[PDB]
From a paper:
LCs were distributed in two groups: a set of eight amyloidogenic LCs responsible for severe cardiac involvement and symptoms in patients (hereafter, H LC), and a set of five non amyloidogenic LCs isolated from patients affected by multiple myeloma for which no amyloid aggregation or proteotoxicity was observed in patients (hereafter, M LC). Five H LCs (H3, H6, H7, H9 and H10) and two M LCs (M7 and M8) were successfully crystallized and their 3D-structures solved. The crystal structures were all refined to satisfactory refinement parameters; in all cases the LCs were dimeric, with an overall quaternary arrangement closely matching that of the previously reported LC dimers. VL and CL domains display very different structural properties in the seven crystal structures. CL domains (res 115–214) are typically characterized by high quality electron density, are all very well superposable, and the dimeric CL–CL arrangement is clearly conserved in all the analysed structures (root mean square deviations -r.m.s.d.- generally fall below 1.0 Å over the entire CL–CL dimer - Table S3A and Fig. 4B-bottom).
Author numbering:
A (entry chain A): 4 to 22, 28 to 67, 70 to 92, 101 to 212
B (entry chain B): 4 to 24, 29 to 93, 101 to 212
Amino acid sequence: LTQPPSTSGTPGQRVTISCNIETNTVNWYQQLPGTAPKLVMHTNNQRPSGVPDRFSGSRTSASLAIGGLQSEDEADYFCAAWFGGGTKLTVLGQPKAAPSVTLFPPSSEELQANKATLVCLISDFYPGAVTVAWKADSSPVKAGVETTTPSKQSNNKYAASSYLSLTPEQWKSHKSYSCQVTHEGSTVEKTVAP
Amino acid sequence: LTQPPSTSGTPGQRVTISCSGIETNTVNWYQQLPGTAPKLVMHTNNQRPSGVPDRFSGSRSGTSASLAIGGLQSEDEADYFCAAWDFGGGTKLTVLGQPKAAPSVTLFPPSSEELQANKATLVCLISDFYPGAVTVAWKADSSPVKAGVETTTPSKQSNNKYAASSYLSLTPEQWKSHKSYSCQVTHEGSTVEKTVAP
């Protein structure tokens, strides 16, 4: 069972995945990253419940047609009969979306534990690429930064977070700290203070 | 089919993977290395397909199942799925490549600026852990909460340990009605639980 390893389409379109079998029937599985494979097609053409009507399958070869392409259809699709390699389906032309930024100062609990951490929460953006710079007062912060790789979430938009570690004495010695998130050549800045 | 989120071992050990639910029906086990299609490694409780090594052995006791992997070898790091009739969530199996490390867990109350916008979000920061797999459970006062919970998938930071964060979206009325909120992180079978209060 060999499959094309990738394919793509734009929302509203119709895409199909191509795929011992001449006698037996073919099943299809949809798998999202970090998730168990989910059956979406039965004895060539019967859908499990919960699978939308947009999905139809047909059958030495077998095919999975996906109608009215949506962002949530982005996935790996495997052929199976009595598994194929896989087909990663990419939904292109999804809308751009600027990020939501929320900056959290160190809590009284942490500062009492003689530590201090700031979190810059970044969510609800697309595409999944950002850059982060920090600022102490108005000056660059060049030490103690980590920014996670953005991962797609339920709402089909990306989320990441950047954190900064300081001593309590630094967080008070300054007047404010700032987190600046650049997404598609447009920047958003948030500031917190003691 | 309940199935533990993650497990781990070092080369040469015997590692087992559990699966529970299935008393009147058999269980299959699937191996999926990164970037590959799921492969059948065990059917009808304990029947090894052709090219599976002897060291894989399936069993089933009561209404629970198990897959044991003897002589753990680096080519076995993968996801393992159990699949019975009337698919488990999976188990991430890691062949330890560095010393295990338990996560730092830091919980934040909502920020001053976002309340003035009718938003109240909690953040549970999770850093410095290996292997890179955790599960997060939020609780309001003493009650489970899943409405509005989003967790980022972990990524390797500069100390070669992993980091992630879970965040809870609430209104300010939810945030002010409860006496406390809790974040619990489970890693390598252990839990840590931090708590906040307005």
